[PDB]
Amino acid sequence: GGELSLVKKVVHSLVVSSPGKLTVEQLMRDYRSAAGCTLPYSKLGFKDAESFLRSIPDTVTVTGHGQMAWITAVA
Amino acid sequence: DGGELSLVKKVVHSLVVSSPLTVEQLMRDYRSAAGCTLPYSKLGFKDAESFLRSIPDTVTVTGHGQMAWITAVATA
């Protein structure tokens, strides 16, 4: 019910709805357009998008580092 | 649909219960909290009131315009 839980569901929907595997920068752009606001990693306490995404392994998997790191839905 | 509306609702409901709101004040509190404008335009509505009237599970609108009064809707 909390905001973290709701953000995790939006991220998951965006990853699953992308046919091809996503980069951090593409997911970032997808969230900004679909929500009208930047992926809220800072509001949730993290220094950058990759740090937040690495904090939710129950939702996504991060492979690599930086803008071009891969983001894939949890198995 | 992917969960974006439910996230806007939760932010809005938190802001309304945490006041003692006009539509104007809700929009400034939303801007101050989320760092973005209340996304009524992206959701297809012509103004904030029309968006807020579209989510009666979350708020109720009394009056019209930016000075309409916004109150929270109780959970089950």
Side-chain angles (χ1 to χ4, degrees):
Chain A
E3 167 159 0
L4 175 57
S5 178
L6 289 176
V7 169
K8 284 165 69 175
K9 295 182 226 303
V10 170
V11 166
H12 193 272
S13 306
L14 290 170
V15 175
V16 175
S17 78
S18 172
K21 166 180 48 174
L22 292 168
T23 54
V24 170
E25 44 98 44
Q26 188 63 65
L27 173 71
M28 273 327 255
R29 285 199 292 281
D30 285 355
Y31 193 109
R32 174 44 183 91
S33 301
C37 202
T38 298
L39 185 297
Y41 61 83
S42 187
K43 173 171 192 208
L44 294 172
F46 298 92
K47 64 169 176 191
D48 55 29
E50 186 189 344
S51 292
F52 166 61
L53 293 166
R54 283 185 177 288
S55 88
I56 53 160
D58 59 341
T59 313
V60 289
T61 299
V62 185
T63 313
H65 296 300
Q67 294 309 120
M68 299 306 296
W70 301 118
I71 307 295
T72 53
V74 50
Chain B
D1 248 356
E4 292 87 351
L5 180 57
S6 295
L7 173 71
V8 174
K9 288 176 176 179
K10 142 78 55 173
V11 171
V12 165
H13 174 281
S14 288
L15 292 169
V16 174
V17 295
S18 269
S19 40
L21 285 189
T22 56
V23 171
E24 188 59 48
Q25 189 62 48
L26 172 56
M27 277 180 70
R28 307 183 193 153
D29 299 349
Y30 190 98
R31 193 41 199 251
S32 181
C36 293
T37 303
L38 188 71
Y40 68 79
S41 203
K42 155 206 109 73
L43 292 170
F45 301 94
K46 77 168 179 192
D47 55 21
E49 176 187 1
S50 303
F51 166 62
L52 293 169
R53 281 186 187 279
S54 88
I55 52 164
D57 64 352
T58 310
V59 300
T60 306
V61 188
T62 296
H64 301 289
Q66 292 299 103
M67 308 282 78
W69 279 121
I70 303 307
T71 51
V73 172
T75 46

